[PDB]
Symmetry: D2
Subunit: 228 residues, 4 copies
């Protein structure tokens, strides 16, 4: 049965969910794991899953009486759609994908992503625990000069309330995170210090995979998801 990594973002946009999501795909592909991808775009466009897509799906489903005359809502009707859609895709490569990485676009706290964050809150409990993961990418600012953790505290705090607890907390730095600083992120985000990852400003994006690998993200995933 499918293994899932969800990648959510906090604090701001342009934080690098794309790069971490691909990097995690690449590190995983390089263990003989057949990995696959879903990009969720919370925007209303019908053009990979979008809000308009899943809404129009449910909207005309109702319009032809699939819901039997009773009132259709975000929970469970939209949220089920999203969860079913995810599972259909996780299967598409003729050997099936073993792990699936879900890039959730937008930022946690956004109104557009509320349905999607709720869908996955429900989904972690549907699939087993050993089959679902949550990587939260957040900004650790630093004006020259100490590295500031509160934005990530609050972001992780928000996501916890919305029902997901991050399993790694990947932090966008400029200079690497000091031990003390990620030990502080640990204190407040519930993960252990090794599960706080700094992806600092590397001069090129091909490093991010190596930057992830060497902070033990390969090893963690195998243990966390149970993987050959």
């Amino acid at each position: 049965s499918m293994k899932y990594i969800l990648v959510t973002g906090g604090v701001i946009s342009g934080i690098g969910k794309g790069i971490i999501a691909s990097s995690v795909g690449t590190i995983l592909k390089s263990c003989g794991l057949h990995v696959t991808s879903i990009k969720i775009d919370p925007y209303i466009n019908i053009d990979n899953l979008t809000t308009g897509k899943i809404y129009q799906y449910v909207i005309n489903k109702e319009r032809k009486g699939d819901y039997l005359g009773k009132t259709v809502q975000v929970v469970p009707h939209i949220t089920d759609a999203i969860q079913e859609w995810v599972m259909r895709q996780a299967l598409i490569p003729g050997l099936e994908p073993q792990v699936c990485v879900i890039e959730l676009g937008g930022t946690v706290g956004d109104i557009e992503s509320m349905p999607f964050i709720e869908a996955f809150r429900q989904f972690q409990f549907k699939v087993k625990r050993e089959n679902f993961c949550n990587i939260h990418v957040s900004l650790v600012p630093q004006p020259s000069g100490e590295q500031k953790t509160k934005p990530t505290q609050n972001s992780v705090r928000e996501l916890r309330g919305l029902g997901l607890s991050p399993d790694l907390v990947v932090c966008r730095c400029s200079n690497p995170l000091d031990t003390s600083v990620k030990e502080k992120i640990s204190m407040f985000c519930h993960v252990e210090p090794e599960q706080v990852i700094c992806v600092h400003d590397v001069s090129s994006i091909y490093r991010v995979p190596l930057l992830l690998e060497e902070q033990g993200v390969v090893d963690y995933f195998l243990r966390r998801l149970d993987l050959p």
Copy 2:
């Protein structure tokens, strides 16, 4: 130019937004004011404004290139739709309606109502201040035995953050609110004590209008909205 009363709900459903919304319509109609109604149903059905209705509107608008190839979102695209829709209806009776009462269905905090609460947050600033109102209906529980205010504090607190400050706070009691208790609701909800209204368990729904009238809701509205 149109005057608007928005009626939102807090704490629980079945609180009586329907009854207060109609009562306010009735008290207002009985001053030679031509009053009109919008019922917003945050549910996905396309059958008075609903989520499915406003989404399908925007969805196929985009699908025929009205939005010029750029990404459509809840803010401003859905929220504009909602605001424009509201104004079109406020005009439909051949003398035009002077005041319009918007029943916002669901409960504040719900994911389904987030777009609608944001639409009106923006709308209060679009129309003038003397043309827009917000009535928040909340539960004041009481197990036999003191009347409990926190649910309303938190509900009003939530709505304030989401960008609307209530102008009256109508409280569903079983027994009338004690002066001290609505003086406490005043302390935390920013309104003055006279703007806290208790609509307690009356033996019939035709009293609610009289219950509202005698707590000065007629007089307040004239002053708050500037009305003949």
Copy 3:
């Protein structure tokens, strides 16, 4: 075996019945012949075995005044929250028995309502405490209100909101205890189960009863004692 902690917290309204629940958990565990101890925390400034805000602040205030924090800035977090955990640890250890062994379980009643300013230090205190003492030995009961208007259906919103809030503050209930007037339908408690993160078996109904003494009986009937044994690996 190491100390086991049961934290009782309240949501939605005060006077929801924390104290009674706290006492009933104490009684029903004690009934198994466990050696149970009890700690009350009032989040008020008034200055045992009964912690209060003023008691804790004065403690940390005095320490700082006497140099104990080595001239560093002293703060609600970590310094007040450290004091709250230190105190709970110490009291929990004191005997309360026929003869002097450490208690096996300590039921903590936290006053106030989740979300209140006055209870924020305490929730945070215990958010950290659950990781210090391992989660195997920590356990949180959240008492909430399920209104039932005659305008027939049993409302779960307040519980949903209160447990979202508590979650975000960093504690996720192990048992959700609902005060309501009639007993909850299975579906209503499967809905709470869904939204909070507990199995339906861990949504406990405490409906209107003839006497407060029927409440420990209500709890036993809904399998709580067996829950705590399984959950905190008690004998």
Copy 4:
């Protein structure tokens, strides 16, 4: 004429430049020949004209111990929050001048970051204070961060979230002051304007400057002095 209050609060990150802004508002008003006074509040336990948490708690603790609350339960709210308002009132009144008239304006620097546990009593204190002293005489500046990643656009989310939070805690900024590295586009500040509830003219840019002494000049250039005269009806 009656005392005028300017409250400076911080969001998103600490070290965002509250103190500098607070000082610059003091300087630029003083430059108009107003008699301005300054109050610092550190939300720490360490025990002027400089309020601290331990100072306030010890105050209320002592009072209760000596019976001043007539045997009633004493709480963060209203009792600590009463103390914070009482103190601000008293200090604000003390002269700071060539000769002894009451100050015309009092700039209050609140330490901490909106959302922190340690600052909750204070925000609440001032939520109530704005209605006691009328809103005509009360005025809140919120300093926030606007990150600018090279991955070109100036980010408003953190400000949006921080002002939602502050709003909900019961203060709505009159001026939003953005720390960022370059100056903000008009559109970026119209966006903040939209989300928070201020006109674009009241979104103030404080970008990277050669010296801290250029910051009062930055403020004057963006019309703040004229804002405060209009907003607090000062001469």
